[PDB]
Amino acid sequence: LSKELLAEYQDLTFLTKQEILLAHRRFCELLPQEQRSVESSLRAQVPFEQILSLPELKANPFKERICRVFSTSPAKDSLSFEDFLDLLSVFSDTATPDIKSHYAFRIFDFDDDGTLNREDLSRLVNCLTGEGEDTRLSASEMKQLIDNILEESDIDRDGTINLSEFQHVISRSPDFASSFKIVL
Ligand SMILES: [Ca+2]
Numbered sequence: 001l002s003k004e005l006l007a008e009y010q011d012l013t014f015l016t017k018q019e020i021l022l023a024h025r026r027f028c029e030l031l032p033q034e035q036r037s038v039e040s041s042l043r044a045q046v047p048f049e050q051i052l053s054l055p056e057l058k059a060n061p062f063k064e065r066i067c068r069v070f071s072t073s074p075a076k077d078s079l080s081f082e083d084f085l086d087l088l089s090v091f092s093d094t095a096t097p098d099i100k101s102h103y104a105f106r107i108f109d110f111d112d113d114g115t116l117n118r119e120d121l122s123r124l125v126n127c128l129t130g131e132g133e134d135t136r137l138s139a140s141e142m143k144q145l146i147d148n149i150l151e152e153s154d155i156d157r158d159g160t161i162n163l164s165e166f167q168h169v170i171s172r173s174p175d176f177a178s179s180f181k182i183v184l
C-alpha cells in the first residue's frame, strides 16, 4: 500500500452527486420525520443502533469495524454522514488494490498504530483464511511466513509488519489473495 496514490485519493472521484443524493434519499427516510433535512443532521452523528439496522452492513461481520474505519471522527466510535458517503461508496469491490488495502489494513489494525504484532497479525492471516472455520486454523505457518519475509529485505527487525512486510505478506500468499479479494 503506497502512500503516493493516497494523494490522488485525498481528492475524490468514486463519489458523485448521484451517489450521495440517492443515498440521502433512502437514508433520509430511515431517520425520523424531524430529520427529513439531512442538511442539519449532517452535523449530527448516527448511533450504532441505527447502523445495525442497515442490511448493507449487517451482511458484513465488520458492522462496527466498518463505521469505525470509515469514521473520520476523533472518537472513531460513531457513524457520521460524510463518513457514510465514503462507506457505501467504497463498500464495493471497484476500489483499486491500493485503496482496497487502506480500508483493509485499518480493518485489521484495531490499534490504528500502523503495524501489527504477532497477535494482531494472526488476526489478519485468519481473517483471510476464513472466520469461524475449520480451514487451516492458526498455526506456525504465520511465524514461518513473517520470518522469511523479514529476511527478504527487513533490517528494522521491529518484530511486526509495516510497509515492506505488506508488499510481501500479500504478494507472498496468492491463495490468500482470493479471500483478500472482497474484505470489508
Ligand atoms: Ca496493531
Ligand SMILES: [Ca+2]
Binding pocket: 154, 156, 157, 158, 159, 160, 161, 162, 165
Ligand atoms: Ca518489519
